[PDB]
Structure formats: C-alpha cells, structure tokens
Amino acid sequence: PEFSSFVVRTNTCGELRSSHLGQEVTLCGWIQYRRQNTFLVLRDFDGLVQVIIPQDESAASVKKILCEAPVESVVQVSGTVISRPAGQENPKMPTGEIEIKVKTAELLNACKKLPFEIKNFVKKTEALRLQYRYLDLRSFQMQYNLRLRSQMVMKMREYLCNLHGFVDIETPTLFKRTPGGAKEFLVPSREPGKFYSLPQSPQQFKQLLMVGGLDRYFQVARCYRDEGSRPDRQPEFTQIDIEMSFVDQTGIQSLIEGLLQYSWPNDKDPVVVPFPTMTFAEVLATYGTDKPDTRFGMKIIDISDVFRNTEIGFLQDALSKPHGTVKAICIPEGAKYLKRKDIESIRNFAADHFNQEILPVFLNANRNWNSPVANFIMESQRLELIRLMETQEEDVVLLTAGEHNKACSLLGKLRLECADLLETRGVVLRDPTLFSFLWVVDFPLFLPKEENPRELESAHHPFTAPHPSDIHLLYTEPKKARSQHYDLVLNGNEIGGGSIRIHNAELQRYILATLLKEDVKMLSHLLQALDYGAPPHGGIALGLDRLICLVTGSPSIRDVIAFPKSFRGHDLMSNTPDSVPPEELKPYH
Amino acid sequence: PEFSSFVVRTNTCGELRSSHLGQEVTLCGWIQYRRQNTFLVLRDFDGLVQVIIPQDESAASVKKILCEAPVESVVQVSGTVISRPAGQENPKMPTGEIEIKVKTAELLNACKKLPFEIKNFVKKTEALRLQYRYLDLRSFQMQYNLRLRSQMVMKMREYLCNLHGFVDIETPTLFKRTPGGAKEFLVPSREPGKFYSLPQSPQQFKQLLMVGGLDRYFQVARCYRDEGSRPDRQPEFTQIDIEMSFVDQTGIQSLIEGLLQYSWPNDKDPVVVPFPTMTFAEVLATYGTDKPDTRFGMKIIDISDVFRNTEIGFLQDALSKPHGTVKAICIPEGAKYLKRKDIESIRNFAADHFNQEILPVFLNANRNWNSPVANFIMESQRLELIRLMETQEEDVVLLTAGEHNKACSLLGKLRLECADLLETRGVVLRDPTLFSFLWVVDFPLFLPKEENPRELESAHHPFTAPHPSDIHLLYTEPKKARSQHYDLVLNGNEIGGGSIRIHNAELQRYILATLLKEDVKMLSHLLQALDYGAPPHGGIALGLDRLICLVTGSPSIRDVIAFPKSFRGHDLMSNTPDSVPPEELKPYH
C-alpha cells in the first residue's frame, strides 16, 4: 500500500516512527490541539504526530501562521524528523517517540468554531453526529468503520472474482415490480402513466444470468426497502448477491465459509473452519429461535424420559397430551452468581411470556436451601439429572413442562433472559469480541397466512427447491414439505440467507398455480427462461451493513454507513425527502 | 483461478487439453449440436469439447438420453479423456486434439425450440437479442464482454484500494435534487408531498467525503440520467468516481494513467506511458473539436501567413475581417487512393456542414490534372506549402478560409470525412486494434447561454478551481477566465472527465452569487463544510460503459451491459416501465 502518494506530501502523519529519524519530510493534515506557544499536533486520517512550533527570528513568520491557525484547520507543515528529548516519549501514541521540527509552513484552509469534539470520537447524539456528518467522519470511529468495510469488501471481491472466478455483474436498478415479498418504491417515467420501480434485490436476474452462462455470478447491489411497518431501518442497504450454476447446498455452504474466512478483518480474531450446521427443527427446538446466539451455550434438552415415573402432579398432566413434553435448560455458575432474588425474575418471566410454570431446580449448590417443589426432584433424580443436564458444582437447571413448541419457545426466550441477567451483576458470556456462525437448513417450503389458511404463501422465495424427500408432500400435504432454503446466522443475527432456486418449469408451473394466477403476466418471462434450458442453480444473499456492523461492534448499522438516514429516510444533514414546485411534477403526472 | 470448483463437476468444458489425456472427468454443460448417432459437443461458458456417443449394449441407456436431449439443453456427462483418432484433430478449437468417452450421463434440463442461433453469436436484431437476452448471454460475444468488464473493473479496484490505498465508499442513491447540470428522476416517498430524487453522480458527496478525512475515495456508482432530449442511451450507467485530498491536476492526471495501464485487459494491446496532454485552445485549434481521434493525425494548420500577398478574390475577403483566417488540412496518400470522383463528395460536404468553400489543392501528385483555382496557388506557393503543410509525394491539401472558429469546426469534421472516405476504397488509418489517449486541460470556466448572455452558466461544474492565472479575470471579465477542469479522451470519445473542486467558501460565495441566489437553500450545507476546514481536493469521473465499449470494440454500449434498455428505457425482455392499479399510488400521492 503506497498510501500517501500522487500528492504533494510524503509520509501520512501517523506513519512516522523512529525509522524516520533525520528524514526530511513534508506532511499535511488537520490541527487537533496545541499548548500555547510550544506545541502542535497534526492529524491525518491515519495517526497523529507532534509538531514543535519553532521559536526564532528566522522562523517567526512560520510561528505566526502556525499559531494563527484556528481550532481544527488544514495546514501543511514541512520539516525534519527528530526524537523527543529524553523521556518526553509517549508510548500511548505510535508517533510518540518522535516529533517534527518545522522548517516552513502554510495555511491550506481555516475553520470556525465546530460544535464537535473530534478527539474523543465525539459523544453520543445521533441527531448532531448525523446533521454534521461530514465532520463526524473525521472521528477515528467512522474512520475505522468505513475503512474496515472498504477493505474487507474488497477482499471478498478478491476471493470471488480473482480466486474462484466469479463475474461482477451489474443488474439494472429501475425495473418492473414483482410483488412477491413486499411492495416497492416507484419512480415516475417521462412517458406518462407508466413508471419503474426499484428492486428489492437482484433475485429476478438471478435466474436469467444463470440461464445465460456465467457459471459464477456475484454483485454488491443496492437494495431498496419501503417499510410501512418499521420506520427505523435504512431506506436503502447493500447486499452481496451470489449465484452459482451446477451447485448443491453443501457447495455454496462451503463457499460462504471460505469467503468469510478469507475476508475476516485480520485485525480482530480469526474465524473458524467449516461452520456447524443445524436443521430448522433442531434450532427451533434446542434454541427457541432460528437465530440463536450459540456462543452462549445454554441448551434446551429433553429430560422427559426420566419423568415416566414420579407421579408428581405438575409433570403428570404434562406427560398427558400426546404432543406434551418436559424439557430443561442449565444455567452454568448461576448457582452462585445471581442472587436468590433475581431468580424470582426468571419465575416472573412466566407471566411475561405466555404464562407457564418454570421450576428453578438447584441440584448441587445451595441445595436444600432452595427448590421447594424441586427438592423432591433433586432428592429423587439427582444423579440422573446430573448425567442428563450435564451440570457442574455450582449450576442451576430451569425446568419446564408443556407442549413441545410452547416449552421450546419459552426456554428459548428464557436463556436470553438468563443472559441479560447473568451478565449484569456478574460475568458476561456473550462478548461482541468473539463470533459464532451457524448454518440453518431445511426450512419449511410453505406457510399459511395472512389470508385465511390456506391460501398459503411462499416460505421465503416463490422458487425454492424442496428437499427432495419424495417431493410429493407438496401435492399430498403442503406446508409439511421442507425446502433447500438456508440461513447463515452470526451471533444471534441473520447475517445472510438464500436457497437453491428451482429449474425445470414443469415443477414451477403448479406451485405458481396453487399460489395464484395472472401472476403469469409477470413471471412467464422467467418460466420461459426455465423452458430454454436453465441449468440447476443456487445462491445466497449476504446482508453487508449487517455483517459489517456485527464485526465492528457498532451500536447501529448507521455507524457502518457513510451517510446513513435515521428514522424513515430524512437524512439529517441535507433536507430530504423534500417537496418540490408543481411544474416539476408536470413532465410525469 | 480455481474456476470450476465448489460444485459437482471437474474441469470446465473448454479447459480440456492433451495434458488431460486419461484423466477421469465428469463435466456438465450445454448441448450445442450433434451429428446423428455419432457425435456430441458440450459447451461451457469457457470453451466447448467433443463427447462421443457410446454405442453398446451396456451404454445403450446412456445413448438413449444423450440422443434424446433437445436442441440446446443442459446435460451432465461423465467419462474418460481420450485423444481423437489419427488426424481427426481440429486445430481450430482448443479441445480439438481430444474427445471425451462417455461412461455415464443424465439430463439436467431440457428445452424447447429457441428462436436463436447460439453458434454464430446470433445475428443482428436488437429487438430479438434483447427480448431474449437471457439466451443471448450464452453467446461468446456477451460472454467475452461481460467477463472482460468484470475482470478489468476488478483490476481497477485492486489498483486503487489494494495498491494505492483508496477506500470504497457508497454514497446514498435516493437524495435531494441539485439542479446544476440537468433535471433528475423523482421517487415518491411514503410521507406525502415530499420525495427523493436519484443522483446524477456522487459529486455532492465528493466535497463532504474529502472534508471528512478519507484522503483517497473511490466508488463505482450507478448514475441515473433523465434526458427528455435526446433520449437514446439508457437511464442508468456505471461510473468510477475518484476523489483525492491534497492533489494537483498533474497528480490525478498520473493516477488515471497508472489506473488504465494496470487495468488494461492484457488480451488486446498494451497501453502507453504518460498520456500526451493538450490545452482546450490547442485541441480546438489543431483538431477542431475537444475530442479528437489522434491516432489519425490529420492536422489543422494555419497557412494564412503566406496569403498576405496573392490578391486572389477568394482569400482576399477572408483576410478581411479582423477575426478571419485561412487554414488547411493535409490528407496523406489521398492523392492516389481516393478516385477523382469522391473528392467531389468532400467539396459537396461544404453544403452539408455550414456551407463554405473547401479547395482541393493537388500540389504534387496528379498536378496540373486538377486544381482549377488552386493551380495558381500551386504554381505560386508550391514549395512554401510543401514546407508549411509538410506534404509528401502523393498528398492532397484541403484548403479553407473564413472565421477562425468556423473554418476550424469545418476542417475538424472534414478530417473525419477524409477518414470515413479514405478508409473505404483503400487503407484504414483508424484501427480499434490500437488505442490513443489524450488529456484536454484548461477549459473555459464560464459560458453565456441559454438565457440571454450573460446570466452565464457553469462550464462543467459550479465548483471548479480556475487556473490561477491572476484568478481575477473572474471579476474583470468572466468567460475569459479558464479552469482546472480536465477531460480524458480515447479515440475521439470522452472516456472520462473531472476538475479540481474549489475549497475555501470565500471564493465559492460570489461565484454562486453571480450565478444565482436562494440556491443557498440547497448549497449552504455544502459551503458550511467549506468553512469547516475542507482541504484542497480534486478528482475525476470515468464513464465505465463507455470505456468498456470502446475497448471491446462493440457497436453500442448496450453490448457491454448485462440487461440494457434500448430506446427510452423500455427493457424489451420484461414489460417496463409499466402502468399500475390506482390503489398503488395511494400510499404516496
């Protein structure tokens, strides 16, 4: 990396070290702060270095402007690199062993009082940080974020296009509306009555581009969302769209693995070898949501087998319904971390979420000092629950009973409860420092609402290859047939998702037929391409702003975006979306 | 490049060579054509290879489907690589020394009669090629084009982000309208009365991002244009937007040079070391347009000095007006290449373009057999015009007289006439196989119309650093002051352009003041960033579709685009822009 080059400058401010002692250099940057007549600190985007204000008869004309420069202004300074006298060194900053002795200077631009503290990476005000964003970008935070994004994305670009031979293909933005997932933004055309609509994602051209050769396609595409429901999320975001020809699920499953591994920032942590997978059934059961945390490690396990006996009233009626069961989660070290008080909050959480009894069994630590109903369970099944739940010296097992799904959802939310609990007043088991990736496969193909069941709906995408599994459960009993759709989850977030799009229009035809007709208006152009010898093809979308936010550890995805828009568009920096004089509506309608 | 990998396949169809003899391989692809029971040819995106239909008792079930596959369908075929028997070899194709012997097969997808010839890279019907585009993409032409684009662009991405340390920064698309250059597309927002507008180019954020640190910015941005007149080339196109901090003109002048050199496709021709530059004055004078061909070399030169004497009536009145002059161009070898007939077309071209007498002087070859008026000029000034025009054995000089600008424009278009003439019925002096680049600097800062001169206008961009040159010609006599704006021209095209945007709002203020006021509504947010200590900064835009078209030698820029739109939007493949039921206008207005 040449860095500062093709410019009048040498050696960006922060790169100077002892190696540069004695070297003549002319560097330019911003004025951070100074102490009276003695000091100056220049700051580039990179680091910052210390410039000593020359005090002399010959250098007085230089000292003039160097001390006349306002708060943070742009100055070019030329001089020689010298080592800081004696123990003046500042190990806290990289340039700290050296200072720069001015020869000449000049004032590139001045500035007025700026309502921001650039030193501390500002302070948290969204309104102000955004209104002044061109200022805020100077902060080392925005700098680190945007530079990370650029870097990592470009390394992905390398992994795909250079390494594995994809092609960077730009699909058009302004296009026709395909109302499968959600409604789209409209864009009036000069020709009256007819107008384009921004795409939700380049999933339309996903099939076509695969039909047209191009064995490997990839794009970073700007996708747009008009959201009636949540004014919070961005009006536009960025996705890495990947599509491959002649590939199974396991293949692209490895593709994203190698992609994230190669692209991983190298600054913070490595990533891991192939990501553990799981089935929609298995995550929904053993976690309680399809997007679990997984670094947590608090597992839902089924102990019902030891409860066949023990006719205690609670578990009795639980084992009754043919769909009923009794499961549990084990919170580690919770035996003594949480006070005996805040477990009553866990019990109270029953009331919050779909009220159901949760039983705090202490089978080892604080034993007999707790567990009023569970004292019998402890004194009866202790060793067995030690084996099953796999507990430790100080541990506590939350024990619930009811329907499979109901109890799974319960313990699922409740382990999160144990997270946000055990982290305060103690150790935190979930740190934004480390990362856990999990594959979620075998999702349902169809789901019933919002019209009265069943007009169904497409699970995720209208065209999704069903896990072959006789394939016919489609016709026999839909919603009972699964798909090849997959989701990548990173630390409880959906980082990306996709499916194996289905070829051979024969299959497509009737799925669209049960779903609805006259949709053939829209999609006959696509199914046509299906009858033109479309190859088997599948791919995945990767939310970029999401992944980059997650990796930078930012509070919101607006910290990983150059000029984001808070709260239903409305960029706070410039007035927009704004009105406009009527004669500007004239060329359209 | 791993190429075919992460998939069930080995060895993409076209890569197989003698090196692969005996290697077991399973490859999948498209069926191009076959001869009866004997032959098959599979085609990947890459090359194509020859599959021999096995005829046997054990292989009959394979021969069944392999001969049952329709015209062009998708088949996977597994077998062993063998050499073609004896002299069956086909040196015309890369896989031609080998064929592939089937072991097993299967039919991935079939197809119906497709109204296209994929072998010959179709035939020219824009309507059909576009309507069926997902088909047309299979053609080796679209393949080469899109793959070239992806490749080269990605290498530019390397040169900037990897090599010289730029940052890839996505500026928002939906935004507020800044009606400097042209009107923009509008996009209705869920909140009634106020709506966004697509950007013409990320030139807005060009200043801000430079204010905010990020010493080097770059982006490939989708720029949307709406031109009511003249609407031929499509609404959206790709640009490479570059902006640097603390850089002169000469710097980025070298930047784009290194960029194009590093990025040059390597397939066709090298590029050249630093591009020859020229001044707007000099190109307009010695070429006749700011975008000359330069590989051509037919120069406009001023011979008026030898015409002070020689009171011949024609040149007489020409030397009369204080702004009048008599200039000429010399077409080489034209003396005998063109017939004595088609020079009457050059003379007739007077009538076509702003009718003015052009005089075909033959001063050497076919002498005295031509030049009715010019025979005197020849017999008088011959040696002198030999020196001046620098002619050769067989040469002919086109001689015109009139206003400086008028005659310059004339000979400017007329050398192109001599190009398209001398190339047919003879040698072609302009070959796409070679590229010529030229820098055009020192453009005017201001130009008078369309309101009555002078309400002026911004030459190119409102904020453009004037070539310092006392700077004050702004106030004294505007339109007489030049700028630092630059244009890159490649083979008579404007490949890219930009300027050094101006810092220090002091200067900006009055330029915007003379131009117009209440524009401060829009741009006070920008000039604010000018008073916040914006560094000196400058950059350039690079038309991507243009450059890629020019390098691939395509007829139109729609051959370098995945899914282009011909003739005022209207993608021919899908119906768009289209109308839409009234209740879909309801959420907006």
Swiss-Prot record, chains A, B:
Catalytic activity: tRNA(Asp) + L-aspartate + ATP = L-aspartyl-tRNA(Asp) + AMP + diphosphate
Modified residues (Phosphoserine): 201
Annotated GO CC locations: mitochondrial matrix; mitochondrial membrane; mitochondrion; nucleoplasm
Known EC number: 6.1.1.12
Binding site for ATP: 225-227, 494, 543-546
Any one Pfam family match given in the protein's UniProt record, by short name: GAD
Residues with PTM Phosphothreonine: 178
Phenotype upon changing residue 17 to G: No effect on its mitochondria localization
KW Isomerase (keyword) present: no
Region (Aspartate): 203-206
Keywords: Acetylation, Aminoacyl-tRNA synthetase, ATP-binding, Disease variant, Ligase, Membrane, Mitochondrion, Nucleotide-binding, Phosphoprotein, Protein biosynthesis, Transit peptide
Binding sites annotated in the UniProt record for L-aspartate: 225, 501
GO molecular function annotation: aspartate-tRNA ligase activity; aspartate-tRNA(Asn) ligase activity; ATP binding; protein homodimerization activity; tRNA binding
Subunit description: Homodimer.
Known role: Catalyzes the attachment of aspartate to tRNA(Asp) in a two-step reaction: aspartate is first activated by ATP to form Asp-AMP and then transferred to the acceptor end of tRNA(Asp).
UniProt record similarity statement: Belongs to the class-II aminoacyl-tRNA synthetase family. Type 1 subfamily.
Disease: Leukoencephalopathy with brainstem and spinal cord involvement and lactate elevation: Autosomal recessive disease and is defined on the basis of a highly characteristic constellation of abnormalities observed by magnetic resonance imaging and spectroscopy. Affected individuals develop slowly progressive cerebellar ataxia, spasticity, and dorsal column dysfunction, sometimes with a mild cognitive deficit or decline.
Protein name from the UniProt record: Aspartate--tRNA ligase, mitochondrial
Source organism (scientific name): Homo sapiens (Human)
Lineage: Eukaryota, Metazoa, Chordata, Craniata, Vertebrata
